[PDB]
């Protein structure tokens, strides 16, 4: 049973707690142990906080990293934006000496040092790796087939891009996340421009809601045209955009889709037999009941 510190940023615990609950339960069912991070905070959200000040972005991400450093554990994440912040600041401060120095003399005011001893993983990346739980182990753990459901994957942008800074391979047409959805028994479908941004990154969600919603609506149109019955995602930002933004699209525009948006951990819980009440699917703006009728 591999053990990881569970970073747990802002949106999953405070808006979609079923995501974190299913994360812990399903990760324990497969051979992974997710340990609470002691006093972790907002990973300085890369858009809304990196746009303001890169130095304080570095300092806060480094503080989050040195918490798990003192814990002597590897970070595990469930958010693409949190992955950007944590993993990328870890990578930058493992190689840039003057930035290490600057962050260290900022952190020395709170009796705290960064040395760069741990690694950062996304939970879906762990589920895909073969040393850690693999696709076959996920298939083994699945107990409810979830058959006869068309499911559209949204990769997001901060997990895989830029490919010159990550290690997940092709960004033009990846299929790894489609294999994790196929392990659950749901057939993943392909839609036009599947690698498009959801529109919520960089603080655009806050600065220009209509612009962000138009970017989201382009995706929703493509997904409905494909014929999806739900949208899996690996990011609470993207889930919030696809969930709230459907309501804001219904009100600001006149478009109705009613497409449930679920984190992959929530689908994994559904596959492994967790209850909809135990997943808190009532906390989503868009009702999941048609999808539950199909897969149950």
């Amino acid at each position: 049973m591999h053990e990881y510190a569970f970073f747990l940023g802002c949106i999953a615990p405070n808006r979609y707690p079923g995501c974190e609950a299913s994360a812990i339960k399903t990760s324990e069912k497969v051979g992974i142990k997710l340990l609470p991070l002691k006093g972790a905070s907002c990973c300085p959200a890369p858009g809304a906080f990196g746009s303001i000040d890169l130095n304080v972005w570095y300092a806060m991400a480094a503080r989050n990293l040195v918490l798990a450093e003192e814990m002597k554990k590897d970070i595990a994440l469930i958010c693409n934006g949190c992955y950007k912040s944590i993993w990328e600041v870890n990578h930058i401060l493992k190689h840039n000496d003057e930035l290490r120095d600057n962050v260290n003399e900022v952190l020395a005011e709170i009796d705290m040092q960064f040395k760069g001893t741990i690694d950062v993983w996304h939970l879906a990346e762990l589920y895909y790796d073969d040393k850690v739980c693999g696709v076959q182990k996920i298939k083994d753990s699945v107990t409810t087939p979830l058959s006869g459901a068309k499911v559209a994957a949204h990769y997001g942008c901060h997990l895989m891009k830029p490919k010159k800074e990550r290690h997940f391979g092709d960004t033009e047409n990846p299929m790894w996340f489609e294999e994790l959805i196929g392990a659950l028994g749901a057939e993943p479908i392909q839609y036009r421009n599947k690698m498009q941004c959801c529109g919520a990154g960089g603080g655009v969600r806050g600065y220009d809601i209509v612009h962000a919603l138009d970017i989201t609506n382009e995706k929703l149109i493509n997904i409905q045209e494909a014929g999806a019955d739900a949208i899996t995602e690996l990011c609470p930002f993207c889930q919030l955009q696809f969930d709230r933004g459907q309501i804001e699209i219904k009100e600001k525009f006149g478009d109705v889709y009613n497409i449930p948006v679920l984190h992959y951990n929530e689908l994994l819980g559904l596959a492994q037999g967790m209850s909809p009440q135990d997943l808190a699917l009532d906390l989503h703006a868009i009702d999941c009941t048609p999808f539950l009728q199909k897969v149950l």
């Binding site: 010159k164 092709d170 960004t171 033009e172 047409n173 392909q190 036009r192 421009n193």
Partner: protein, 662 residues
């Protein structure tokens, strides 16, 4: 010994960094120095006259010139030393310009003067110990080899043969012609590309002075400028030419190219000439215009069914049990003309080359548009066989790219061939529109700008924007090309029926292996390197090897042919003379110091060293022709039994001692 020291000013390039007067007075007070003197331009005719007059007047044993680099002016001053009654090799330079002045210009003058005095002292110390050498002259075999049967190889072979030298033309493939045989029409003259080549192919095939050896490779090369012992692998063609059939005893003949064999062969495989678009049997020719019309057998795919031999009948040209024969050929010079291949553009995933059906590259487009290709010359969509009406051309596909996937250089001809293809589609399909997504149209050659003007006049759309990514419509299989029109200032989404990628070119497959066999180095770009990038673009640093064609860097057929004839001329220079002088830097074994340990023998890359019998004692023997003067053996030998002719241990140690003299 009596040494003369002549210090050049180089026209203030040296006098503006040191005190030439002080250097000269120090040279006068140096030991062994008979005369020290200075001049503004020692490389000029008054400078050589000054050297010669000094030699005659002062009875000089050796000459030291404190001037520019030896790599720049050894031949000049060696010839000046010869003219004057000395050996050319009683001369030594002291580089006090490119290693003293130009690097110690600013704010440091007496330091540069002291450095110059030190360099002059070391040069005088070496020259007081130099002694006479005579360059070795070696005979040159009157044959030549041309590796590559493309336009550059064929032109070089024809040029050498018509100059009268017997020539070998080695081609790995069963036919000569190269890429130009695959081209359909040629920019900017729009001539039938294959047709222009056909007379020259016939000339090569008929020339009595050319030994055309197709379907053959170069296993190994040893030797030097004089004699290159080149071993060739005659791959098992499986079919006998009439000459070989008569030699083996079949009077009725060999292969006449009737085609019955391929009419009955049941195996069907892709044709590499047609870039895989077209079928060909196990026994086959690339196209109907191949020069040796001899019908290779593909032994990796033949099932030995024996139908081909029954079809061939009394001609008995097919020998299904043939094996790779090896031949050793002695040649005087060699010309390398290996050409190029298209860079693998499936690595650029944003342009769905392998993943979308209707995305092709420019050689596949050229085969599709040729009238002798898999189609009847009709461009049709690979996805469904329908005629396109909008065609996009992605220029710079994998080129001028610093991301590590593509090539950082320009492929030279891809702007021109994309213009040609746009013209061809707009004239062959009525109402079809060509869109060129370009980033610097490069029509630099003769009539190229006029060709560009004419294409725009016929109505190709030029969108200045590098393509960002390509999406495939799920149903119509049409391709959505996304970029920005940089001049218009807006993003664009052009939906085309067919997308053509003007991919970069790279050195052919196996070219690095062949150039390592011949001893040629590579450029920064990965192409074969030339002797001097400006004034010697054909010859290489290894003597007797010359470059021709795209193998030295991408070029159009005109530039390729000019380069090929230049290489043929350079390869003919030593063959016509019949003599060639080697540089007397060889290793010479001092036998009554050699102990016969044999340990130096394995330190020679060229196998110039061996153990032999002289006066009962087993001593080492140098093949002075094979030695190249590196000095590894002579730097090894513990007993000092190997002497390096112009860089002897006493000379080098005298230089060290003079440096530490104060």
């Amino acid at each position: 010994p009596r040494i003369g020291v002549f210090v050049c000013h180089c026209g203030t390039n040296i006098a503006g960094s040191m005190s030439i007067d002080d250097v000269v007075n120090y040279a006068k007070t140096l030991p062994y120095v008979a005369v020290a003197d200075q001049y503004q331009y020692m490389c000029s005719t008054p400078g050589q006259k000054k050297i010669d007059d000094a030699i005659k007047e002062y009875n000089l044993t050796g000459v030291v010139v404190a001037a520019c680099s030896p790599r720049l002016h050894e031949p000049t001053f060696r010839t000046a030393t010869k003219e004057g009654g000395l050996n050319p090799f009683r001369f030594e330079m002291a580089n006090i310009r490119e290693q003293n002045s130009w690097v110690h210009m600013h704010g440091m003058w007496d330091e540069a003067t002291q450095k110059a005095k030190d360099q002059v002292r070391m040069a005088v110390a070496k020259a007081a110990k130099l002694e006479d050498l005579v360059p070795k002259s070696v005979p040159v075999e009157k044959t030549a080899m041309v590796v590559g049967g493309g336009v550059a190889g064929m032109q070089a072979a024809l040029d050498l043969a018509s100059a009268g030298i017997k020539t070998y033309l080695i081609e790995r493939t069963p036919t000569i012609g190269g890429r130009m045989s695959q081209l359909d029409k040629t920019f900017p003259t729009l001539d039938c590309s294959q047709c222009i080549l056909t007379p020259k192919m016939v000339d090569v095939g008929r020339h009595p002075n050319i030994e055309m050896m197709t379907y053959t490779e170069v296993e190994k090369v040893e030797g030097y400028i004089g004699n290159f012992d080149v071993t060739l692998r005659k791959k098992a063609r499986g079919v006998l030419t009439p000459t070989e059939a008569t030699a083996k005893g079949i009077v009725g003949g060999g292969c006449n190219g009737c085609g019955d064999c391929s009419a009955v062969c049941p195996v069907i495989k892709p044709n590499p000439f047609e870039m895989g678009m077209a079928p060909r049997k196990a026994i086959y020719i690339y196209h109907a215009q191949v020069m040796p019309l001899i019908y290779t057998v593909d032994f990796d795919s033949c099932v030995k069914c024996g139908l081909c031999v029954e079809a061939c009948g009394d001609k008995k040209a097919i020998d299904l049990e043939m094996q790779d024969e090896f031949i050793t050929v002695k040649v005087g010079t060699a010309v390398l003309a290996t050409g190029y291949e298209l860079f693998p553009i499936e690595n650029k995933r944003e342009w769905g080359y392998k993943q979308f059906d209707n995305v092709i590259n420019a050689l596949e487009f050229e085969r599709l548009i040729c009238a002798s290709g898999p189609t009847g010359g009709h461009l049709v969509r690979p996805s469904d066989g329908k005629t396109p009406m909008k065609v996009g051309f992605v220029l710079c596909a994998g080129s001028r790219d610093n991301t590590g996937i593509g090539k950082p250089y320009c492929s030279r001809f891809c702007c021109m061939y994309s213009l040609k293809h746009a013209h061809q589609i707009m004239e062959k399909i009525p109402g079809a529109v060509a869109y060129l997504f370009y980033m610097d149209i490069r029509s630099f050659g003769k009539m190229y700008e006029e060709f560009y003007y004419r294409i725009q006049h016929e109505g190709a759309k030029f969108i200045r924007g590098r393509v960002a990514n390509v999406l495939e419509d799920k149903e119509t299989k049409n391709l959505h090309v996304f970029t920005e029109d940089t001049l218009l200032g807006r993003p664009v989404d052009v939906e085309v029926d067919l997308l053509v990628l003007a991919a970069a070119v790279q050195p052919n497959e196996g070219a690095n292996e062949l150039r390592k066999k011949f001893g040629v180095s590579a450029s920064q770009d990965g192409w074969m390197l030339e002797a001097h990038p400006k004034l010697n673009p054909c010859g290489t640093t290894t003597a007797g090897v010359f470059l021709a064609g795209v193998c030295q860097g991408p070029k159009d057929i005109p530039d390729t042919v000019a380069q090929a004839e230049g290489a043929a001329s350079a390869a003919s220079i030593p063959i016509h003379m019949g003599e060639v002088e080697l540089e007397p830097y060889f290793a010479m074994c001092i036998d009554e110091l050699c102990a016969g340990c044999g340990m130096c023998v394995n330190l020679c890359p060229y196998s110039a060293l061996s153990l032999g019998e002289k006066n009962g004692r087993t001593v080492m023997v140098v093949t002075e022709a094979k030695c190249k003067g590196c000095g590894t053996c002579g730097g090894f030998c513990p007993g000092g039994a190997i002497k390096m002719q112009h860089f002897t241990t006493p000379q080098i140690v005298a230089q060290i001692d003079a440096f530490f003299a104060g």
